[PDB]
């Protein structure tokens, strides 16, 4: 057979997508619930602009998005008949664990500041604005991650 | 093929999945162990503004 | 915070509804409006309180009946959310109430100095702070059986022996030391307490509504020693709470002021109590404050220091119904906006 | 960091220009320096308008700012003459240096033939390849140590300058002297190590050539030189330099108490003097650190963030790289030149505050503040 | 399967890109929220410095793209033949630029909270919260340095 | 308002690394992996320069 | 801790071992692939399919508690919320209903090798695939249980506030949600396409 | 022992039957006493509602249903001749049940202590409470179910 | 010893019935430990209610009894020369039983002790309190009903 | 795969020059931490005292300057044919200068945060606070000084 | 390599070199932060005393002069052909030099701080401060000789 594809590369595969969705899951996860604990606190008070302060619970979303778009890459990249090769599996491991932590990493620091962003937005108006560009400070953090999984597994296809 | 004489496969399988047993084990008793009563409303308090 | 839903959730959902029975700035200024006290409590039945107040004729409503009724129901039901959890909930209930108790057993101190009466001064004793002990303290012959008895089988005993050594407390007055530096010790237990085993947000959020409450204990002591100068400072640094956030920076100053020009000094050095004493009345200054602090404790929606929020919100709350009928009763009409409220 | 001893000498003047060079050879790139310098210049030329008109947050301490940049910028072109290197990339106007073998294969490992010595800076050739980290890196600790250590002979002089000045003369015989002879003995005799190092070109002397930085912690051991001597008796005589070290530490222990708590806080003194000395003549290697460090990070972003060259003379390719260039030019002058740049700064102004300053710099005075003011339109309230 | 070069080399290079952008994404992660919370807390009484303080944001920012640049390159670094001593120092690479920014982001988590909560009290403590934040950066930036010279040795003279 | 220094770096250091491509310089062109072609890197470089010089004009808009 | 010190003594009796092995230059007698070769995959593949809709099981109910408990509470001041609230229940458990899909559908692939025989490619790619197909539905089943749990008890909460200010928090729970078709979907995808157990 | 039915493959089988009765005793338990510490306190002040307030508890009881019931019908497959993979089966159906059962009995005790509780203060919160644990119960008949079809499925076309 | 009856078979078997009693003594301990404290701290303000409150002991020593006739029942079919078989049979009856006993010992100590402190007060919350107590005890029931079968299982047809 | 010079070699070299700077960024990042608290702390009171105590966060940045020096001379010596005992020694070399700057950047914290608070008070402390910053430092030279021992041997007649 | 002097030899040796400054750094460095949080809360009533109450940091000072002048000579003692027992007596030397520092470095931080905390308020206490010190340094100094005699027997007669 072809040393460079042991039989157990596939396992390597599924522990890069399977690791990605995860991790991706749990920070969404976590930033939905910090987020809406906070416009949960803030509604019974000021009801009014939860709908403006709704926009963390979009960004864990757009999390899941990363999340979703780099699991099914690796998914459909991923077959028995194919001979994939060993180096390809501990690629798309790394693919993974990459786009999972850094969704993780990004969802725990969004959840936290658009909590307390949203907390302290009912008592000051205009602190909307540092609010959205954390927001997007946060977003570029899980942005990283999924564009080092797209090159890390492109490469891993090549 | 064997990996090792002493640590052979079918031995690691039942280890691993011991292993998964014994950690969820492990965790249902830390959230049983966990159980602790509302003494407060199972004892008829001296004070007037209970009674 | 997901393991807090666990055993405290039913207590969290009802003390958000209780929270929804908060009385508001709109419905105090209907309070306003009101001419009579039996106008008052008419008015008032249509708020949260209810029908509480119809077990009293008009001709024997007084404002202090009526601040009694409000805070009996408020103490039951205070009572209903202690009994009703277990476990560290349970004990950070017991330190809320913990306050309330070191409160009842200083007043109790007094009457065992001098024995003139015992049966009114425990009946006399707001219900909150009750423990299981105090009619056996009450029966107290002199201040050594107390100091025996508030050392065993009452939660007094960690302070006491910490702060007093046998029973040397003819030569302290209650008030002004034994009252407020066993306070200081019950404040220091609680803030540790809260600083072990409370979770994120409740530690973030009760440790600094606890630093402001040693806050404001420091600056009233501060103020209110400048007078006399009997108390010396090394007991005034050791009556200081030492926990809080002005402490040391602030603390260490706040001893050594030895008049308001001290104190004024001291105080505004830091930010958030800049002008604090320059203007007005520090009891509306440190109520805003402390409304402040509890508003923010509601943003949050799963947190242990809820309650605390919740119940240091409807004392301040009855404290402002009382205000607003006195100024009706005791006419006045120019200080009923001195409420401090905000809901 | 503090102010003067009431007439001593003050640390100022020497910082006027060490802590810009300091400051630039650490930091090194041309471009990054020059468009340093550029805003440098915006202050400088327009100081007449800018005095008059509130500094604020656009430029706040800037605002007594402008002619140190300057000056720390055009250190920083020298530097940038000495490393070769316009931003990261490096220059080929002077002569060229190294010639690797005319015959090369397709993608043969090549090494290269010193037909001679590059005339001002580090030499263009070994831009690119595998060996240039390690050439230059050998090559900025030697020179970051030998510059440290003069800064340092520099340094100590004022601290005989302030005492002759003063007309003491226990004081002199107490500190300077055995502080001299020990700080030389040591880290001087390695800087006279490392320059006989260079000066004899060890492999056509046949004799073996010590390592870059091996021969001081060689000789940590033993009198007993273990191999590799730089020259005749050179790694043998030095042992009297040791010993004389060695002999004056009680002497400086001794000398100033014998003129209650005066020996005690002189034998904390020596002890600080030594640790003090052995620790900043360390430290010294800062310098080296930035400027490797601002050297990779310039390399890392040119070859990252500018100059793709996708899109080969066509239209779409001329906005793409427009686009690259001016998200490069502003990726350069924030992060570079601010955070970089004044770090370098900080670095720099510390080593002043203390290797320099600490060695001569002990009496602090009073301030004067005499009685005047310009005018009060602040707008006080 | 070569004996300097076994299948199995491409783990470490993998697991050294993997980390490279998971530790620095995990550190940058904290200094924002921890800044984020400073911020937001401590300018809601005074609003008009929020985009002043918003640098630490930045500077957390700046870790992620420090992440971002070492794992693309030690990616372009990956191949199959690869020998293990490459796969060994793609590994070091990434596992200094990962912790070192992770570091650096513990760093500019509490200086950030501090030097805000101090800012919005005191305005001139600003220019020492950036001294700080930037030594904050460059202690990631030294990690990069690392990073960066060790995946460019991890490829020229392999067999 | 900043486009203004932005422009003029776009003009002078955008054209001496333009020219010293088109010099088929060793540092910058003909390496293994650098594109060989000097003179065609040359055109959209020089372009990119016209464009900043037409920017820097636009940018002097100050007065 | 005493368990801080068993994780301790565990890291170093590991680290020691694999040191011990790779000095005495066995390093590949700890094969971590040979282990996984020689492994039956219907090991894997069950531990998979048990795991998946275990593990939705669990995410359910945590959710389904961390959501009732506190509605209870909340619809003790007012009950007006309880019927219009068990919509974030429904959705809780929409979770298990997913788990109990994704089990049955795995459980479409389980069948008898021949023998030794197919042991192979075929056989250990499904084995594989279903176990971290099932961990992959499984653990994101749990988390988004998890989140719309919170998010549900925040919205009890919230209710109990103000009627409208429910229909703008369960917007919140159907983000958490979309966690849940989003591992459904990723799980069905990356488990789909390996075959019986031929 | 031979390969496809090796010696040490009843070793899953007896832990299956072991844990389908373990892990569902044990959430059945939790639930059970989370229950009657609510029951318990809250009928101290409302004996009428004692008799009805039962019902968790009944629920519970019916998680230890699904234990015995899914235990016993899965001892009826063992033996020493067994193969690994009924085994397999086996095990894989025992932790399914085990743990749905596990998940439920702790979501019928909290819920059930939450809505004995209401029930205390609120009458008509007890039809809620109700219908909190019909759905919690479904969810442990949905691991029932996986469990069933799992051993089902394993005693046939086996070698 | 053949590979279908291998010599560490018995120490599979003597674990299975140490755990078997070990497990449910632990439960019944802590049960009666429980409920031993809520007597002690009840029966201080009503003495006459004892010999009544004592029924929760009585039931976690009927848990203990479950251990007892487990490991009683498993220690007869032990030897030497057994299967592997047998010995994995004994394991998994010991470990349910004894997994299920301390599951019935947390809910009878937790359950026990809640409802005399309740009783202490309420004299009809005590037949609440029994009914509690046996729906608790069920579980302990039904791990001693698996324990039987599987120890019945253990023999048949063993070579 | 040489006696001396096995394949695994470089695996060591790598982890010892990565973690010279790791333990390094890590103890320096804590030392910064601690020392901008105390700063901000200082300085939102006494604001002009702010760059004259900036001293204690270059203290913290002198452990990352020598994990950064280390690092690059440990590189210096990678080589994929290297022998096990230039890969020993490295991995040595680097653990011990990364561990002495951790322990230094501890020092370097916690006695400039003590530092910082009290020359907020009183003035002169401020030389007392620098000298203990300067042994604290001088712990990480010493450090530094054995790691250059162990590196300028390792690759010393190597065979 | 004969098995006499194993390949692996030298990685005792080495880690032994890292570990002694290792652990006497951490322990120079906790008793010096933690002596220096005394000097800091003492010299803002006392500046003066600082040049006396400064003696606990220099005795941390010693304890990492003997970590690495031990350091220094056991890894001039290594060599790639080195025999097995001289890396395994100098692993020893190293852990014994650097845990006995440690120990040291504990009681030195405690003893100093508490002292300095008493001796600002009574002078003649600094005597007491000053000999305790002493009887806790010499635990360093007993790792200093027990370190130093290991090394003598490192390599003599050795084969």
Request: aromatic share 12%; hydrophobic share 50%.
């Amino acid at each position: 057979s072809n040393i460079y594809a042991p039989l157990y590369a596939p396992f390597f595969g599924f522990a890069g997508c399977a690791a990605a969705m995860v991790l991706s899951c749990l920070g969404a996860a976590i930033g939905t619930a910090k987020s809406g604990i906070g416009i949960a606190g803030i509604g019974t008070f000021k009801p009014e602009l939860i709908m403006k302060s709704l926009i963390p619970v979009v960004m864990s979303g757009i999390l899941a998005i990363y999340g979703l778009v780099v699991a099914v890459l690796i998914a459909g990249n991923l077959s028995p008949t194919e001979d994939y090769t060993l180096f390809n599996g501990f690629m798309h491991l790394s693919c993974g664990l990459c786009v999972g932590f850094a969704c993780l990493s990004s969802g725990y620091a969004i959840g936290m500041v658009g909590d307390v962003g949203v907390r302290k937005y009912m008592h000051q108006p205009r602190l909307f604005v540092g609010i959205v560009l954390i927001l997007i400070f946060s977003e570029v953090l899980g942005l990283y991650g999924m564009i080092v999984a797209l090159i890390l597994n492109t490469r891993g296809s090549e | 093929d064997i990996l090792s004489s002493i640590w052979t496969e079918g031995l690691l399988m039942c280890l691993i999945v011991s292993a998964l047993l014994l950690f969820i084990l492990i965790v249902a008793l830390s959230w049983i162990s966990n159980l602790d009563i509302t003494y407060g409303a199972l004892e008829k308090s001296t004070n007037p503004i209970k009674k | 915070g997901v393991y807090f839903n666990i055993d405290n959730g039913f207590i969290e959902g009802v003390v958000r509804g209780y929270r929804n029975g908060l009385l508001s700035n709109n419905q105090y200024i209907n309070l306003t409006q009101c001419d009579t006290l039996e106008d008052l409590k008419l008015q008032l039945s249509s708020t949260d309180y209810g029908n509480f107040l119809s077990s009293v004729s008009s001709e024997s409503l007084t404002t202090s009946l009526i601040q009694e009724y409000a805070s009996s129901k408020l103490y039951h039901e205070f009572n209903y959310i202690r009994d009703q959890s277990s476990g560290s909930t349970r004990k950070f209930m017991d330190y809320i109430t913990y306050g309330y108790m070191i409160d009842n057993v200083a007043l109790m101190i007094t009457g065992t100095i001098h024995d003139r009466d015992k049966g009114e001064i425990l009946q006399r004793c707001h219900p909150l702070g009750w423990f299981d002990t105090l009619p056996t303290l009450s029966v107290a012959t002199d201040l050594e059986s107390l100091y025996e008895t508030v050392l065993v089988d009452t939660p007094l005993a960690p302070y006491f022996k910490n702060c007093f050594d046998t029973a040397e407390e003819l030569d302290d007055m209650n008030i002004e030391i034994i009252r407020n530096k066993l306070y200081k010790a019950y404040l220091e237990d609680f803030y540790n307490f809260v600083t072990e085993e409370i979770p994120e947000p409740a530690k973030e959020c009760m440790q600094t509504l606890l630093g402001f409450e040693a806050d404001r204990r420091s600056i009233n002591i501060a103020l209110n020693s400048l007078q006399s100068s009997d108390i010396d400072p090394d007991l005034k640094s050791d009556l200081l709470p030492n926990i809080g956030k002005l402490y040391p920076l602030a603390t260490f100053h706040l001893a050594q002021a030895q008049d308001f020009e001290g104190v004024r000094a001291a105080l505004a050095n830091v930010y958030e109590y800049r002008g604090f004493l320059e203007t007005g009345n520090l009891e509306d200054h440190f109520y805003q404050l402390e409304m402040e602090l509890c508003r923010d404790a509601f943003t949050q929606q799963f947190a242990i220091s809820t309650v605390w929020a919740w119940m240091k919100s409807k004392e301040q709350e009855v404290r402002n119904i009382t205000w607003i009928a006195e100024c009706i009763a005791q006419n006045q009409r120019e200080r009923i906006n001195n409420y401090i409220s905000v809901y | 960091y503090g102010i003067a001893q009431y007439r001593e000498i003050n640390a100022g003047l020497p910082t006027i220009v060490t802590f810009p060079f300091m400051f630039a050879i650490m930091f090194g790139d041309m471009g990054h320096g020059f468009l340093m310098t550029l805003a440098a210049l915006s202050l400088v030329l327009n100081e007449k308008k800018i005095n008059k008109m509130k500094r604020g947050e656009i430029f706040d301490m800037a605002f007594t700012g402008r002619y140190i940049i300057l000056l720390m910028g055009v250190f920083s072109m020298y530097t940038g003459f000495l490393y070769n290197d316009i931003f990261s990339k490096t220059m080929t106007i002077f002569k060229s240096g190294w010639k690797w073998p005319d015959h090369w294969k397709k993608g043969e490992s090549i090494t290269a033939t010193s037909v001679g010595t590059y005339p001002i800076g580090l030499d263009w050739a070994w831009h690119g390849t595998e060996n240039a980290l390690l050439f230059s890196n050998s090559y900025k600790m030697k020179l970051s140590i030998l510059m440290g250590f003069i800064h340092m002979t520099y340094s100590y002089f004022f601290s005989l300058a302030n005492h002759l000045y003063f007309n003491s003369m226990i004081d002199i015989i107490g500190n300077f002297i055995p502080g001299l002879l020990f700080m030389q003995g040591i880290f001087g005799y390695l800087s006279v190590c490392i320059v006989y190092k260079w000066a004899v070109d060890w492999v056509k002397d046949g004799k073996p050539a010590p390592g870059l930085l091996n021969m001081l912690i060689n000789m940590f051991l033993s009198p007993g030189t273990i191999d590799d001597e730089l020259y005749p008796h050179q790694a043998k005589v030095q042992v009297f330099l040791l010993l004389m070290a060695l002999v004056c530490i009680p002497w400086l222990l001794l000398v100033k108490p014998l003129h209650g708590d005066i020996m005690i806080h002189q034998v904390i003194h020596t002890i600080e003097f030594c640790l003090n000395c052995v620790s900043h003549t360390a430290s010294y290697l800062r310098l080296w650190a930035l400027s490797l460090a601002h050297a990779q990070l310039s390399s890392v972003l040119w070859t990252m963030t500018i100059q793709i060259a996708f899109g080969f003379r066509g239209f779409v390719g001329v906005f793409m790289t427009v686009a690259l260039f001016a998200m490069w030019f502003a990726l350069t002058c924030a992060v570079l030149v601010l955070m970089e740049g004044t770090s370098a700064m900080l670095h720099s102004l510390r080593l002043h505050w203390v290797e320099s300053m600490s060695k001569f710099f002990v009496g602090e005075g009073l301030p004067y503040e005499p009685f005047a003011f310009e005018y009060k339109d602040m707008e006080v309230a | 399967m070569t004996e300097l070069c076994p299948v199995y080399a491409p783990f470490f290079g993998a697991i050294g890109c993997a980390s490279a952008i998971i530790f620095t994404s995990l550190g940058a992660a904290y200094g924002t929220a921890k800044s984020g919370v400073g911020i937001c807390a401590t300018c809601v009484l005074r609003p008009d410095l929020l985009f002043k303080n918003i640098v630490p944001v930045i500077m957390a920012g700046i870790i992620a793209i420090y992440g971002l640049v070492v794992s693309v390159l030690v990616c372009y670094s990956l191949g199959q033949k690869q020998a293990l001593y490459t796969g060994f120092i793609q590994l070091g690479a990434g596992l200094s630029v990962g912790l070192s920014g992770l570091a650096a982001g513990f760093a500019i988590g509490i200086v950030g909270d501090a030097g805000v909560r101090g800012s919005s009290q005191q305005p001139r403590l600003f220019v020492g919260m950036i001294l700080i934040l930037i030594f904050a950066e460059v202690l990631g930036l030294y990690g990069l340095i690392v990073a960066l010279l060790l995946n460019s040795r991890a490829t020229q003279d392999v067999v | 308002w900043c486009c203004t220094v932005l422009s003029a770096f776009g003009v002078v250091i955008l054209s001496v690394i333009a020219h010293l491509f088109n010099t088929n310089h060793e540092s910058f062109v003909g390496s293994i992996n650098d594109p060989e072609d000097g003179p065609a890197v040359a055109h959209t470089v020089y372009l990119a320069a016209l464009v900043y010089l037409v920017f820097f004009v636009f940018c002097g808009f100050q007065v | 801790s005493f368990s801080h010190f068993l994780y301790y003594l565990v890291l170093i009796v590991v680290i020691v071992y694999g040191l011990y092995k790779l000095f005495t230059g066995h390093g590949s007698d700890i094969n971590f692939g040979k282990f996984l070769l020689r492994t039956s995959p219907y090991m894997w593949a069950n531990l998979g399919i048990a795991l998946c809709v275990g593990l939705s099981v669990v995410g359910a109910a945590w959710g389904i508690f961390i959501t009732g408990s506190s509605m209870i509470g909340a619809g003790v001041r007012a009950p007006r919320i309880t019927t219009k609230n068990l919509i974030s229940i429904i959705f809780c458990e929409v979770v298990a209903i997913y788990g109990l899909i994704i089990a049955i559908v795995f459980s479409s692939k389980l069948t008898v090798a021949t023998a030794e025989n197919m042991y192979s490619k075929s056989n250990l790619y499904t084995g594989y695939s279903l176990f971290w197909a099932g961990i992959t539905v499984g653990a994101s089943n749990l988390i988004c249980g998890i989140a719309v749990g919170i998010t549900g008890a925040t919205a009890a909460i919230s209710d109990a506030a103000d009627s409208a200010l429910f229909v703008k928090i369960l917007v919140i729970e159907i983000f958490g949600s979309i966690l849940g078709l989003l591992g459904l979907i990723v799980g069905l995808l990356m488990a789909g396409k390996a075959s019986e157990f031929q």
